[PDB]
Amino acid sequence: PARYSEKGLGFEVRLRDLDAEPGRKEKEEMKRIEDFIVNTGKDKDVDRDSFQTFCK
DNA sequence: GATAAGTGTAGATAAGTGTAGATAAGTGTAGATAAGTGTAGATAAGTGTAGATAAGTGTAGATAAGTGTAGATAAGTGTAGATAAGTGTAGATAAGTGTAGATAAGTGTAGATAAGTGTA
């Protein structure tokens, strides 16, 4: 995720419209979806592929 | 205490100025050509005059800008339910402070050598 990467390089989950401002729950849902992608799943599990292994 | 910077003193040459003569700058004077102006005639700028075409305006008809009017879809708002932001509450570890002993910063104190200044 770019969110945690100070150089901004990575991926992000975003609202579609550039003009919208995200609601209080939407900002958290977007962070959850980012985390889900990183973990490739709901829970953390070292036995599962990371997103890096998936992409490779 | 020992030498040589620093100044007064004495003589020898050539800067510095007045004086006298020889040539050519500087000015007045006389004559010869051509600048400078008035004068007379020939051509074409400059203006008024008369006719010929097409700018410039009013007039009449044909199409489509411009507005009011009627119906169909979906912006815009209120209303009802479902999940998870947001806050209070209870327990577990380790920040944060006071307290006790060991080492070495920090200061006073005593003696030896050499800048520090006067003197010959």
Tell me how far apart the alpha carbons of residues A37 and A54 are, in angstroms, rounded to a whole number. 10
A29 is near strand B: CB distance < 7 Å: yes
Tell me how far apart the alpha carbons of residues A46 and A53 are, in angstroms, rounded to a whole number. 12
Answer whether A18's CB lies under 8 Å from A32's CB: no
Experimental method: cryo-EM
Query: In degrees, to the nearest 5, what angle opens at C-alpha A54 toward C-alphas A48 and A56?
Result: 135
A25 is near strand B: CB distance < 7 Å: yes
Which nucleotides of chain B have an atom under 7 angstroms from any protein CB?
Answer: 84-86
Q: Which residue has the tokens 């100070």?
A: A6
